[PDB]
Design a protein around this ligand. Structure first.
Ligand SMILES: NC(=O)c1ccc[n+]([C@@H]2O[C@H](COP(=O)([O-])OP(=O)(O)OC[C@H]3O[C@@H](n4cnc5c(N)ncnc54)[C@H](O)[C@@H]3O)[C@@H](O)[C@H]2O)c1
Ligand SMILES: NC(=O)c1ccc[n+]([C@@H]2O[C@H](COP(=O)([O-])OP(=O)(O)OC[C@H]3O[C@@H](n4cnc5c(N)ncnc54)[C@H](O)[C@@H]3O)[C@@H](O)[C@H]2O)c1
Lengths: 254, 254
């Protein structure tokens, strides 16, 4: 994948991992870089624009928990302007096992819904050109932080969902891969809530082990995007980039 | 584990797999069998009651998609009468990838929320005796049926969540294991919707391959319950019972 001249939508581009990934993305000569995130960040937006004046950077206020109809409407506006979108990159995520419904709504349901919405424009069965989806999942989707069982379960859901998207590519025209960071120093893991307060010191304990910086994660993230491998399960841990092999425990035969 | 004289709550006891499991359970001489299900089935109720008049069987009309406070209210009703409950079986589930939110709400959020609610009565930190949770997940939670990616992801979530529950047992006193049937002939799989209609013949095709009966499933379900292995991931496929080993791709080190 050559990012020169591509159009990219990045949901949650201005978070910890998001901003460092965006800093790296705009170093490529993208045609359009469209940011979809909850809250504006003027400072971050100005910096990205400064990194590469050749890229047209736009921002839209966006919340993944809205109905699928509301997402399509935003996407229509974007596709109407750009005519083509090359990549959708999802990053939306919260870590707070006190908020059960909201964790599931954001990390799992919202991702499925944005995907379902963009399929309206990309599905080759509806006359679409196909597309690429990069989903930020998490190593916790392979093996949980059992102290945040709901967060970890929402991530196991999206690793699975992404794996299925990739297997559906020959039908839909939409390829997909997961981006699964290991522990990364951002405001996500600085202070957080465990389920039923099973471990009030969870953040302190987690961060008392090796971590990577969001800078290292961002670098490997854009590397994974350029590799552009349908069905890849990328592990971005301790500053390395590594594809993992999913174990075959069962098969539907279809 | 000896089921004799035990008090059991079975969410969704009267469906395909549920009824044949419920038959095998009542033959094991339970003291009380508490059924929580979305709709009444007087025929099934009458029959179960007759299989062992010794066993005290009650029924509550219950929908897993209510808030945790509502669930806690019903459980207080039940605990106040029974004093003790030994085992909770969470068996509620739908298969319909035209219903994204509801699939997720029922198969994932609902299971987490009943678990969360009962923990208020069982958590050893709260003066409770601990307990046992048996979660009906699915082989699709290991490897998807990719034509029902939402269903399969919702199952990957509960496999993970159950794995984490088990690891939290030294803290909460509540042990847990997953029951993962392979394809089993019930009203669930008679016919059903694929996501975005990617495969309109998904049921026809799936059912042209080997299956098991709900009777085979139910017999192996009680066998695993009697085995009482914390953190077990039981595969109940093609009339067999099998413990599978989860791959270690990553470690939180905590
Ligand atoms: N930090 C880590 O160690 C780590 C590890 C593995 C995976 N992840 C995942 O990477 C992603 C980014 O996390 P981060 O560490 O940069 O945390 P962060 O809190 O700094 O950023 C989270 C991002 O998600 C966005 N977001 C949250 N709720 C949203 C909503 N309702 N609608 C739209 N956007 C929303 C935020 O606005 C922000 O852009 C998340 O999916 C997270 O689960 C993080
Ligand atoms: N049949 C299979 O091949 C298969 C394979 C793996 C896992 N499973 C799982 O086994 C469980 C039972 O499925 P089944 O095959 O007996 O199908 P089924 O449709 O016969 O039974 C579904 C059960 O779930 C209950 N339920 C559904 N929605 C509910 C709600 N909102 N609140 C409370 N209860 C609700 C139903 O009343 C019923 O008791 C489900 O979790 C299903 O996902 C089935």
């Amino acid at each position: 994948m050559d990012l020169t001249n591509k159009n990219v939508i990045f949901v949650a581009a201005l978070g910890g991992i998001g901003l460092d990934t965006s800093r790296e993305l705009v170093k490529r000569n993208l045609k359009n870089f469209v940011i979809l995130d909850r809250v504006e960040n003027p400072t971050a937006l100005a910096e990205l624009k400064a990194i590469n004046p050749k890229v047209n950077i736009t921002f839209h206020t966006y919340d993944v928990t809205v109905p699928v109809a509301e997402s399509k409407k935003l996407l229509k506006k974007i596709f109407d302007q750009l005519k083509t979108v090359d990549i959708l990159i999802n990053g939306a995520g919260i870590l707070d096992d006190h908020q059960i419904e909201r964790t599931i709504a954001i990390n799992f349901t919202g991702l499925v819904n944005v995907t379902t919405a963009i399929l309206d424009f990309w599905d080759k069965r509806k006359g679409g050109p196909g597309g690429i989806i990069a989903n930020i999942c998490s190593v916790t989707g392979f093996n949980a932080i059992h102290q945040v069982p709901v967060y970890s379960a929402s991530k196991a859901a999206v690793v699975s969902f992404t794996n299925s998207l990739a297997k559906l590519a020959p039908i839909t025209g939409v390829t997909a891969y997961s981006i699964n960071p290991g522990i990364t120093r951002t405001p996500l893991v600085h202070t957080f809530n465990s389920w039923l307060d099973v471990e009030p010191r969870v953040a302190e304990l987690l961060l008392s082990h090796p971590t990577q910086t969001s800078e290292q994660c961002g670098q490997n993230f854009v590397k994974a995007i350029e590799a552009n491998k349908n069905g890849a399960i990328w592990k971005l841990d301790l500053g390395t980039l590594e594809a993992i092999e999913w174990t075959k425990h069962w098969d539907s035969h279809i």
